[PDB]
Design a protein around this nucleic acid. Sequence first.
DNA 1: CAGGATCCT
DNA 2: CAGGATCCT
Lengths: 178, 174
Amino acid sequence: SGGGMLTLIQGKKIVNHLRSRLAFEYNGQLIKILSKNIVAVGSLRREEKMLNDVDLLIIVPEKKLLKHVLPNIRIKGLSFSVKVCGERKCVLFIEWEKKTYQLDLFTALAEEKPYAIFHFTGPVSYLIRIRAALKKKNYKLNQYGLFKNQTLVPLKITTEKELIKELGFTYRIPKKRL
Amino acid sequence: GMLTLIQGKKIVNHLRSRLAFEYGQLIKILSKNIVAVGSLRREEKMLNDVDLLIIVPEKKLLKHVLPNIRIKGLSFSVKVCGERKCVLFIEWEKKTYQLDLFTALAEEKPYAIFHFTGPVSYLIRIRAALKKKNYKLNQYGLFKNQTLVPLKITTEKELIKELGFTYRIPKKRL
DNA sequence: CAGGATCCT
DNA sequence: CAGGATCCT
Ligand SMILES: Nc1nc2c(ncn2[C@H]2C[C@H](O)[C@@H](COP(=O)(O)OP(=O)(O)OP(=O)(O)O)O2)c(=O)[nH]1
Ligand SMILES: Nc1nc2c(ncn2[C@H]2C[C@H](O)[C@@H](COP(=O)(O)OP(=O)(O)OP(=O)(O)O)O2)c(=O)[nH]1
Ligand SMILES: [Mn+2]
Ligand SMILES: [Mn+2]
């Protein structure tokens, strides 16, 4: 909200800096968050020229760690403060090159990954259309899975691309989703 | 600000004839559709606020009742306001007090009254007991496997006894 | 469309 | 225990 606007390139340099610097405390132990479990989402992934904030999705190996990842987040040698922080969303105000920016951290479990990536990539208008179409065929789609009568629909997929095509829609790269 | 029980009762009495909503038309809220709930109904000597449940004749009016609430002969402001809860800061005498307005549909009335009467500790026990027999109780109804359990009850007393619990007057619930 | 964190009810 | 309003995501 109050955070400064970033250029796409500014955002990419922040993500790159953070890729090696995130960690969390787990019952005392300090566990590094692997760069490969950090997916850049939001307008940055859609490669928009200006961004209101930086959105990172964190992929967590086991459900037991959800309690601990965002609520005990750490960033090596970066000045920041917490706006709000639960298990699924944490909003930080970070200091970067003498400016204050909003950094949004989200968590997905490994089995949720492609649904999460699809959700947090957006844009909002695109997701409303996609979900409404699935709603007319009696499905509910969210960031956790595809559902039918409050029951998980177990799709045999791994990637976002595979998800979208399994949902019965045309795949477009993030940049071309409107 | 904190109220005595009697202060609270005089506020409710004043408001009983003064609530209305728009909606183009201005519709009076009947005193008989206004139930005092919360610690006032439990007759606690001191209260943190005044809680009133408003009973709505039809579901189509939910959109309009609290979101277009009006009070004749009173100065106030809205804190927050949705279809189910509206919180007002009212001027009474020479003081500011919190007034909480809740809505229940007619078919929900006894569930709402039971919920908003409390106290919280009592409701947690009651609901946990029903949870062990696979029911869910809330302010809207009694449910089983995401299906409304159609008890044909009218009053709160009838509800509690139908739920299989001992009826106690609000003052003695704990 | 769908859901999350906060601070309540 | 179970859920609501606000302002986000
Ligand atoms: N389903 C759904 N998802 C949303 C909604 N708002 C945001 N999201 C998801 C998709 C977004 O790409 C992601 C990040 O939200 P942001 O508000 O940061 O928007 P985005 O990053 O797209 O642009 P911006 O930060 O404004 O440059 O969260 C919503 O109303 N519904
Ligand atoms: N199920 C449930 N009901 C609640 C909860 N908190 C409040 N309520 C309901 C029952 C309460 O009697 C009613 C009014 O809440 P209040 O916070 O105003 O407490 P109460 O009025 O009993 O005392 P006070 O207002 O503090 O004098 O709302 C809760 O956590 N769970
Ligand atoms: Mn963003
Ligand atoms: Mn109260």
